[PDB]
Amino acid sequence: NTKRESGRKVQSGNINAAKTIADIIRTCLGPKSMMKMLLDPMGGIVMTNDGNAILREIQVQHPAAKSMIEISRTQDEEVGDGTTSVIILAGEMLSVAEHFLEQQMHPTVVISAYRKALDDMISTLKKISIPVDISDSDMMLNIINSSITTKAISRWSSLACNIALDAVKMVQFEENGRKEIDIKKYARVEKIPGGIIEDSCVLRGVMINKDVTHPRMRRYIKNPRIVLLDSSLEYKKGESQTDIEITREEDFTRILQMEEEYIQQLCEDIIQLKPDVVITEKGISDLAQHYLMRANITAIRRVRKTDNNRIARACGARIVSRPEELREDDVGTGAGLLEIKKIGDEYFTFITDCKDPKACTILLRGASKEILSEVERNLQDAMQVCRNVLLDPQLVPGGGASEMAVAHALTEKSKAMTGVEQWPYRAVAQALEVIPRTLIQNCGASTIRLLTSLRAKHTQENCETWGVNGETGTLVDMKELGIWEPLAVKLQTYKTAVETAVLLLRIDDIVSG
């Protein structure tokens, strides 16, 4: 429409929106988490350690609160964790740096100071990034346990340690000469009903639960060859064309059972030509599956065309129409295991594949229906580590001490790179140290004096190598505390926080058309 808002009032309005979001989430961060309680507008209490569940249900304000969800959903899509971490960084830089730089009135040199701050971050980050062995599970077990122990639930953390550390190593690119981080479609989590953690087997490969659910279908074949159309399946799926009577209820029932009867006639070639797995990307009826029991062949239904390529390249399935009339078959083996387990009347087909482009979804078991989801939550924090240790064997220590170490590295380069640049460049260095100060604020001491003891620690002996505890508030070795910071989170969350703070600085006008 016709709408214009004058400058400073909007950029300050960006500050008031983002900082108040950054208030409680900074205290909801880490093992010193608080809980953000939303009272329902229809009555009812909701408190978690995740403000994204809180914010997306409640009325999001317009000026800067809308952009923080957008940078969070990108943060939640990639690694999941750190959505709490991104939003508290940008609003803190938005509050501390901007307001007097608004008085000196320059947007541009602030934006250039973000480019100076991001590059100074990487140089001091790699020097303290410590390589752990990707060929040793216990070197990876120490960091994957650190991400799960943000909660007080640590009983089945080791069950989450066992399955994830070997699956994501098998999840690779389609380029297949490459590692680093897995993709969410190629690494999924689903719960398997019933079961015990003493039967939660380590699955690396892809599971197909649209496979066998009845024991007459395919039993223990090492190459489950998925069979598309054209010799064992044909194109006829219609009707024998009985007469159309508009004044009868039994007419519309007969036309559907005649449709199923030709699907019975398609599977007559499945008896005579003997597949082992047949597929249908349009989905078949359950009554079509009973005649496949007479064929002793499993079905695959409610799937897509791209699901069948990524499994058959992985599990070693040959794309055939007959096993007696072959069609230049695929690889004969890519599978390390063929195992089908049952819960009730539901067989769950597993096949473990080795360094393969599969759309992986792992096995997980708990003890109960609610505690099946607790294992599922633990594997979510597990896969963030397993992609990162695939991404970066090097990684930093820290409990927020690295955030101070980035903050002090800027301050030295603030005094070294003298000029007009240093005043936004030193102001954003002040914004970083507030967050671990708040983590040791919940620990409880003269946290401002500790903040001095943070900085005197940095340049003298150890930047954050000897770091600080964020559950006691004491300067501890973060290598000896066993708590480690994920290096990709140190990459990604800093990259996202500087981009949001640029865009909220550039805006001073909103319209509604």
Partner 1 sequence: MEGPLSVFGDRSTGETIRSQNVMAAASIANIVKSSLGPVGLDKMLVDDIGDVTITNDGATILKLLEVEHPAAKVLCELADLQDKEVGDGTTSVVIIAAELLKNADELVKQKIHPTSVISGYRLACKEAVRYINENLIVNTDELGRDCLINAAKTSMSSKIIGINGDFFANMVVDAVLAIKYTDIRGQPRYPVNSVNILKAHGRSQMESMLISGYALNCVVGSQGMPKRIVNAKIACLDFSLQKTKMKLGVQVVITDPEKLDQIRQRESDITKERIQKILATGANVILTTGGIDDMCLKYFVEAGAMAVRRVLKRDLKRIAKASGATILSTLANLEGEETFEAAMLGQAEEVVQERICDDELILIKNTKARTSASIILRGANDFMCDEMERSLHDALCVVKRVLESKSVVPGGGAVEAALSIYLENYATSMGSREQLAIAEFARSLLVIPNTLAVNAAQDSTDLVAKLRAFHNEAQVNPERKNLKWIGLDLSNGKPRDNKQAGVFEPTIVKVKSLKFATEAAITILRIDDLIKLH
Partner 2 sequence: MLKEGAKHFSGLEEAVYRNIQACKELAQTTRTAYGPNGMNKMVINHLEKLFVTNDAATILRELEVQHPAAKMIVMASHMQEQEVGDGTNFVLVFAGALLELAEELLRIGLSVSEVIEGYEIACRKAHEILPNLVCCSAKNLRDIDEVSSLLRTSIMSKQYGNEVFLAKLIAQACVSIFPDSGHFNVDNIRVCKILGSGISSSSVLHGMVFKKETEGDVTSVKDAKIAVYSCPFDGMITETKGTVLIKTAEELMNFSKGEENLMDAQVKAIADTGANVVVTGGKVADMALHYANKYNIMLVRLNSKWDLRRLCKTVGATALPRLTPPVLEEMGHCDSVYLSEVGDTQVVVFKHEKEDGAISTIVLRGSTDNLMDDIERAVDDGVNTFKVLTRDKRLVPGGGATEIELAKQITSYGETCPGLEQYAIKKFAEAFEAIPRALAENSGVKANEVISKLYAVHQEGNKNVGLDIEAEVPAVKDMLEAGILDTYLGKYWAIKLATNAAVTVLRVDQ
Closer CB to partner 2, 50 or 412, in the complex: 412
Residue type, 371: I
Helix and strand numbers (H, E) in the chain are 19, 12
E strand spans, 311-421: 335-343, 346-353, 360-362, 394-395
Strand, helix or coil at 70? Answer: helix
Report the partner that residue 290 touches, choosing among partner 2, partner 1, none (CB closer than 5 to 8 A by kind): none
| Alpha-carbon gap, residue 491 to 387, rounded angstroms | 13
Binding mask 437-466 for partner 2 (x = CB under 8 A): -----------xx--xx--x----------
- Does 452 belong to an annotated binding site? no
Closer CB to partner 2, 241 or 418, in the complex: 418
Tokens of 154: 């640590």
- Does 82 belong to an annotated binding site? yes
| Alpha-carbon gap, residue 285 to 299, rounded angstroms | 10
Residue 349 is inside which H or E element, if any? strand 346-353
- Does 36 belong to an annotated binding site? no
CB of 419 to partner 2, least distance (A): 5
CB of 116 to partner 1, least distance (A): 15
CB of 438 to partner 2, least distance (A): 12
Residue type, 130: I
| Alpha-carbon gap, residue 193 to 215, rounded angstroms | 18
Binding mask 403-432 for partner 2 (x = CB under 8 A): ---------------xxx-xx---------
The length of the chain, given as a count of residues: 513
CB of 393 to partner 1, least distance (A): 19
CB of 48 to partner 1, least distance (A): 24
- Does 84 belong to an annotated binding site? yes
Which residue in the list 182, 353, 356, 381 is annotated as catalytic?
381
Is residue 45 within 8 Å of 37, Cβ to Cβ? yes
Closer CB to partner 2, 99 or 301, in the complex: 99
- Does 126 belong to an annotated binding site? no
Of residues 272-311, which lie at the interface with partner 1 (CB under 8 A)?
305-306, 308-309
DSSP 243: -
Which residue in the list 20, 48, 50, 472 is annotated as catalytic?
50
Closer CB to partner 2, 109 or 491, in the complex: 109
Residues in the chain after which the backbone breaks (C–N beyond 2.5 Å): none
237 binds partner 1 (CB under 8 A): yes
Residues in contact with 419: Cβ distance below 8 Å, sequence separation at least 6, in sequence order: none
Residue type, 110: V
Q: Check if 84 is active-site.
A: yes
CB of 192 to partner 1, least distance (A): 29
Residues in contact with 377: Cβ distance below 8 Å, sequence separation at least 6, in sequence order: none
Q: Check if 353 is active-site.
A: no
Tokens of 40: 């329902």
CB of 231 to partner 1, least distance (A): 6
Q: Can you say whether residue 39 is alpha, beta or left, with left for phi > 0 and alpha for psi between -120 and 50 degrees?
A: beta
Report the partner that residue 237 touches, choosing among partner 2, partner 1, none (CB closer than 5 to 8 A by kind): partner 1
Q: Which stretch binds partner 1 (CB under 8 A): 138-146, 182-190, 193-201, 222-230?
A: 222-230
Number of neighbouring beta carbons within 10 Å of residue 293: 15
CB of 372 to partner 1, least distance (A): 34
Tokens of 499: 């981009």
229 binds partner 1 (CB under 8 A): yes
Is residue 212 within 8 Å of 218, Cβ to Cβ? yes
Burial class (CB in 10 A: 0-12, 13-18, 19+), 461: exposed
Of residues 155-184, which lie at the interface with partner 1 (CB under 8 A)?
175
| Alpha-carbon gap, residue 274 to 278, rounded angstroms | 10
| Alpha-carbon gap, residue 481 to 168, rounded angstroms | 26
130 - beta bridge partners? 395
| Alpha-carbon gap, residue 338 to 353, rounded angstroms | 9
- Does 85 belong to an annotated binding site? yes
Residues in contact with 41: Cβ distance below 8 Å, sequence separation at least 6, in sequence order: none
The edge-to-edge listing of strands for the beta sheet with 277-279 is 226-227, 277-279, 298-300
106 binds partner 1 (CB under 8 A): yes
Q: Check if 83 is active-site.
A: yes
Q: Check if 306 is active-site.
A: no
Report the partner that residue 423 touches, choosing among partner 1, partner 2, none (CB closer than 5 to 8 A by kind): partner 2
List contacts with partner 1 (CB under 8 A).
1-2, 4, 62, 66-67, 105-109, 175, 228-231, 234-241, 262, 265-266, 268-269, 305-306, 308-309, 319, 327-328, 330, 503, 506-513
- Positions that interact with partner 2 (CB under 8 A): 104-106, 418-420, 422-423, 448-449, 452-453, 456
Annotated binding site for Mg(2+): 81
Q: Which residues are annotated as a binding site for ADP?
A: 30, 82-85, 150-151, 399, 470-471, 485, 490
Residues of the binding site for ATP? 30, 82-84, 399, 470, 485
Residue positions in the annotated binding site?
30, 81-85, 150-151, 399, 470-471, 485, 490
| Catalytic residue set | 50, 83-84, 381
